[PDB]
Ligand binder design. Structure first.
Ligand code: FAD
Ligand code: FAD
Ligand code: FAD
Ligand code: FAD
Lengths: 431, 431, 432, 430
């Protein structure tokens, strides 16, 4: 076993660090003045432009598919460096990666070649979005006997017709509310949308993913695709994840990602299991920023006494606790992405590892920031330090990309409950 | 041992509820338009006027002194209800109450009579402020061999001169920066302000409190009292606790609160101990709002499944923990304030009890809000729910009114180390 | 709202401390030499005898029933003091109180006179036991469509016939495996125990509670009542809570506590709700022993340093955390028992408050002992300090008297899910 | 970066599992029958003899020194599997390993050849002990201004004379109270043993380590080495770790491990930093055993309901928390022992990683056993299940090998305060 980093992993970090300090630091001046989420998203566009120019969007796509992604560990290193400085724009890149994911993961070379083309080109500001989440919630989307997804699709002649709404999909409306360059819209197949899901059919068998571009939207009536709102978020205030409504929205059959059913469900699951592991690097960056600020304060400030506050056992204990959390978190992330990439392992082993990573890293990032604030004391509470930003940003992570309580713990529980569950298969091999 | 609320206690609750619901619910429409801390604070003035009209500022002064304060339990119940709805204005009442505490507590009926006058009157918008906090910190203000406080007073004729800076004390500059109606100003006595605090005298013997009114500020040079800045706070965005420089600020010897030394220190200590216990009522209110919003949602939203989410064991567990935290917190506060009102108990017993309460209630209120958010899920992260505001507001409590790590734990630690410490004396009497 | 203790409350404390110090401290010399759980329990009998002679068994019964119990706060005070010193015997008093509770709680003056008599007499060592728990578990006993209690009862002639097994109930086989003086056996009614519980009958309608005395077991054939085993416990090593089998065991109709069904269930629930609140006083006692052993040590020992270890912030933070846990716990127990005594409040309100109390106090006591051990350091791991004993003892509380995970949180969850749930009813009263 | 185990790491696992199953499972029948720490310890001798015969004492010594230790990850793997079955004897192997460390780590080929020889032989049941801990405690043993260690040493001609008491060093008195085969006794230098440590000299500059054998004990007066007492322990009931008193105990100058001072302290510091990391494997072993037992139970028992209790979210949440604690702990331990083997990293980087690991893994292993018990419920409280044993064993770890509160957090805080502290040097290089 090995923990050493290669020259190009070391370079990937140097490059991501450089980008963060030279480019992303300048972003606050532009978005801090805007009146709302959308404007603050729009003021972010030139920084996403620079990220594309630096190859960061191209690096969200595997090498065999024309991108530059060297590995999932390189990816982890990049995300942590970025989120250590400024989640603005950084969150657009990662939201774009998710959106590309069902396409990256399908076994259809011609579909990939067409749809990933803008994203590997090294230019523009193309945006991808995985449109899964809904106003009514999705923790229970695969629950047999339940409502199911409220965005449905039916086949009409040689087209699919989407009806229903999405909420929260990052990047989905695009820069101008005329759409992301690529959106993957997860639908429940229903022939009469006003009929409840059949309580006797397994919900996973009814799942379709329909690709939807700016062109698809142009080719529809204006009212067929409405943005009804843009949530005002506690943190990550520069992202866009609108409330969209599809009313008799027409999509070409050739935009069906694969055959509706368990394969389509499996592509969503694998995309979201991969983000589950990666999202830990986001959490580590944010909490690393809280820890490093507090550490530098504690080593340079006596707080009106006769020694630096790091010499007080209780200040030390908090920073120790922060340190341990960050350390165990990065290890777990790296273990998990490395598990995901191992072709010898059963999916359920990869899935379980990814769930654990998401649950642990996200919950523990929150503790890390709060402890860092407690250690710095009253000064962490005013906006001339980073903490107020960090505090709101960190609380996203346990909630988002499938909430720990409703989704990730339930997915893990389900694997653990199977007869053939091998707890240590990712470590000690399969028995 | 009895827990039953009196008719006067239930009236105070009803009364505080009616004020919060009819008056403080309107506050937000006003201050959300303003674009900085002071603008927001001033927009709060009409609601503080209303609070004086409802007699809330007068309810802060005991009966034997012309105010209507019935008991500390009444006060606990009042603060809980205000904070469960709106910390705007509510925070001003409490900051005013802290400001008046040292006057309320001193041996001197003529000073009590002259300075409390505008607060017991029922008219105007009088503000008070107890000015202890400094830019360099205060956790070590009483450390022997330390630099002590940096706000110092010297005796020059029939006057005291103040040199130094203050940060954070809420209300200190009044509505307009011409000063609070009654500021107490905790000072280190130094004949030569440019000489370091002598490392050989207990710092608690150099303490002096000087009463500074809007009049004193008018009877001084325009450059003798300056507001250097106003912190943009993470939460409690409508409060004012600015950066204040005293340069050659002249104060009448008659405005001296008591004898410099252990008595002056004891007065600051007794004031901050009372606020330590009462701060838990603010923290309970903020957390109670988080819990009840989460509870109402759990009991009425299925989150796209077949049953209300409270029916999920993991969701219920979160709410159970919130509930427990809130219940133990309230008991501890009521026990704390009762202990402070008992005249048979030594001071160290009331101190230790008050310290516990500040530490517990404020740490646990943060947990309660985060858990409530986790139980609600993604929805809790947008501003059509209260949680974003509550999260920011709740992170104030472990940090403010003497942070737990630096101040309250060491105050408690000092007491427990004393040779004659009786841990259970507030419960089973002294032996 | 008022926290002062009365002279009679201060007397209950003094009396219990004196009892614990002078009597209960001699018990270890006796039970430590014994080779198994039963022997350790038997070696405890002289100390239970002394408990009776000090009237501690009579203070488990209300005054209106000929007992000397003054209140539930008095009770809580007494239990903290006893558990702060030694849970041997102390556990037997409280097991007995639980076993007496269904009888104490019924509305049947003649049964009370009859069955409670030996416990109010100040004589002998009479044992009671609430026999509910079972080999297969009880967290799901009331689950519609589940198998339900495996101890069943059927009426034959003017008698009931008990079939099946209990496990865990303290005192249940009495001093000698010939039975507690009074056991309340919780059964599910069933005419043919070979048949599964009916999945369309609400389980709570099928509950029965049968009084089983030493007289009742003597009147049965030898193999109708058998002790099959005695669990060897991590802590509370001197308590007895055996594995009992009933095979065709005959009980007289006159010993049925009340009509089978919801009223039987309500009796069990009420008793376990009361014990839920009082179990917190037992947790408080154990943890307080830990906190105080550590506090003393921390202010007497420098651990080769120049200042007493209480003077290190990390050590203080532990003790501060222990103290906060003990103070908040005690407040909650007094709040809960006080709420339970409040006639103006609905059952749901009392139940919820008791569940919280059990959950909080028992979880947090564990933490309190572990932190105290961490504060003292390596020395806390050797049997010449109390900690090894306290750590095994404290882990019982979250698991026993209805575990927090399977039972108590489920009970509280269910109350919280009711449309008419008022969270602060016990503080601010009901909104109609 | 790589997580894959080599063929020989998987073989070391198989070998440790098989030995734990075929041999260690029979230990309890012997020691349970016994009445006190020592007799329980002595009842363990045949199982150590089998550990030696299986090559396990030899695998505690590096290959350059004639042992068979393949690497510190192999070691981590070996200990995890041992402690997941039975800590008895298992503990004796690691106490021995620690007691050999300062000889393994010194740079003195003649001391190494001489003192490591019994332990690489494959024969007997030789024991080693690192005798550092004392009745008055050791968290403050390096405190300038303090009393310092209370076992002192002074030079008399061409020998050293030891004066003081040790408490807790596992194995120290050997099997029969006539001493470990090798003990490394750590003393403070004091010409006058009744004189208080000079408050003006750095205590680290006065540390000495003296090698004591069964022969050094034999060559002394009967009453110069007294075993005063044997603590009865909450768990790990089969170890010996006596209260020992040296009164005028003569050691040949040649048995002095190195030059007194910073270097002797450094040998002790490195030995305990290595153990600080490996001690995490033990804690994983105990906690894994708890977790596996609770998992098997939850997947096959309905607790009188209609479904396996693992289908209840509250139960699954406990097992998810245990699983996470174990997974993070193992990753951390492997990161730490690897960090320690990296010649390119400075010591303070290695120290800090090791302290993190001891603190995290041992704290978290406790919560893991307790959460496993709570998921299982009442039945976990009785001795027909493993939990009562596992509960007492697991509380050893946050407290032993330098307790977290007094020793390991202070060693870590001290590193974090240095001007040159690089938090991420072990991950992102210097
Ligand atoms: C809304 C609001 C209202 C406020 N109202 C008032 C008011 O009315 N009047 C007033 O005077 N102040 C007020 N303040 C400030 C408040 O009282 C703070 O608690 C005060 O500034 C002291 O801060 P601190 O406890 O973080 O200590 P600091 O001195 O700032 O220390 C900072 C941190 O350093 C560490 N530290 C320092 N010394 C030690 C030590 N000896 N041991 C262990 N750790 C140590 C601790 O981790 C501590 O948290 C207000 C602030 C806010 C935001
Ligand atoms: C910045 C940001 C980016 C986002 N990116 C995307 C994106 O790119 N694409 C996308 O599709 N979505 C995205 N989302 C949404 C995000 O992925 C959410 O996690 C998602 O909406 C599901 O939320 P939830 O986990 O709270 O589930 P919900 O269905 O909203 O359930 C909420 C809560 O109900 C409870 N609950 C419900 N069911 C159960 C159950 N069966 N068992 C136990 N508890 C239960 C839990 O407490 C849970 O937390 C984003 C959101 C944000 C803020
Ligand atoms: C000293 C001592 C004294 C005792 N006194 C008595 C007594 O006087 N009378 C008596 O009858 N018993 C007594 N007991 C037993 C005690 O009351 C136990 O709590 C009882 O056996 C039930 O145990 P349990 O809560 O673990 O439930 P179990 O039914 O055994 O379930 C075990 C575990 O399964 C899981 N589980 C099962 N169902 C669910 C669910 N629906 N949801 C979530 N999780 C679930 C939980 O993790 C639970 O902890 C005593 C035990 C001891 C050690
Ligand atoms: C099975 C077993 C095997 C062992 N093996 C060995 C061995 O082989 N060799 C050996 O030498 N020892 C051994 N030990 C002892 C073990 O290494 C202990 O950790 C050691 O004695 C140190 O104890 P301690 O950390 O509690 O510190 P102590 O000095 O005993 O202090 C105890 C407590 O005091 C407080 N404290 C003291 N100073 C401070 C401080 N400055 N700051 C904050 N808190 C402080 C802390 O809370 C600490 O936990 C063994 C013990 C056992 C049970």
């Amino acid at each position: 076993v090995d923990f050493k980093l290669s020259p190009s992993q070391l370079e990937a970090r140097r490059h991501a660090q450089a980008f963060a300090n030279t480019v992303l630091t300048k972003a606050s001046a532009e978005y801090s003045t805007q009146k709302d989420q959308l404007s603050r998203f729009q003021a972010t566009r030139p920084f996403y432009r620079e990220a594309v120019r630096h190859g960061l969007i191209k690096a969200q796509v595997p090498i065999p598919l024309g991108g530059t992604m060297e590995s999932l560990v390189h990816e982890s290193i990049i995300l942590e460096e970025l989120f250590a400085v400024e989640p603005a724009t950084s969150i657009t890149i990662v939201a774009t990666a998710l959106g590309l994911m069902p396409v990256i993961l399908c076994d259809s070379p011609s579909l990939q070649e067409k749809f990933l083309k803008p994203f590997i080109s090294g230019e523009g500001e193309p945006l991808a979005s995985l449109m899964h989440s809904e106003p009514n919630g999705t923790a229970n989307w695969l629950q047999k006997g339940g409502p199911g997804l409220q965005t449905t699709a039916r086949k009409v002649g040689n087209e699919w017709v989407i009806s229903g709404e999405k909420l929260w999909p990052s990047n989905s409306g695009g820069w101008d509310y005329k759409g992301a360059d690529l959106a993957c819209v997860v639908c429940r197949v229903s022939d009469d949308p006003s009929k409840p899901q059949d309580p006797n059919v397994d919900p996973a068998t009814q799942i379709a993913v329909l690709l939807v571009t700016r062109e698809t939207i142009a080719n529809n009536k204006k009212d067929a695709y409405q943005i009804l709102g843009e949530p005002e978020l506690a943190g990550h205030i520069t992202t866009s994840g609108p409330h969209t409504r599809f009313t008799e929205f027409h999509v070409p059959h050739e935009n069906l990602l694969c055959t509706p059913g368990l394969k389509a469900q499996g592509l969503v699951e694998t995309a979201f299991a991969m983000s589950a592991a990666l999202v830990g690097a986001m959490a580590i960056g944010t909490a690393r920023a809280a820890f490093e600020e507090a550490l530098v304060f504690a080593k340079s400030d006596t707080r009106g006494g006769s020694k630096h506050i790091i010499e007080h056992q209780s200040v030390a204990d908090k920073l120790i606790d922060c340190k341990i959390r960050l350390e165990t978190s990065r290890l777990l992330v790296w273990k998990a992405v490395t598990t995901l990439e191992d072709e010898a392992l059963e999916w359920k082993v990869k899935l379980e590892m990814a769930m654990q990573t998401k649950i642990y890293t996200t919950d523990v990032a929150v503790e890390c920031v709060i402890d860092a604030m407690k250690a710095v004391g009253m000064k962490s509470y005013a906006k001339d330090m980073s903490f107020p930003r960090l505090l709101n940003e960190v609380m996203c992570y346990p909630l988002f990309n499938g909430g720990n309580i409703g989704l990730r713990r339930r997915q893990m529980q389900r694997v653990m409950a199977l007869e053939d569950y091998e707890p240590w298969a990712a470590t000690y091999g399969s028995s």
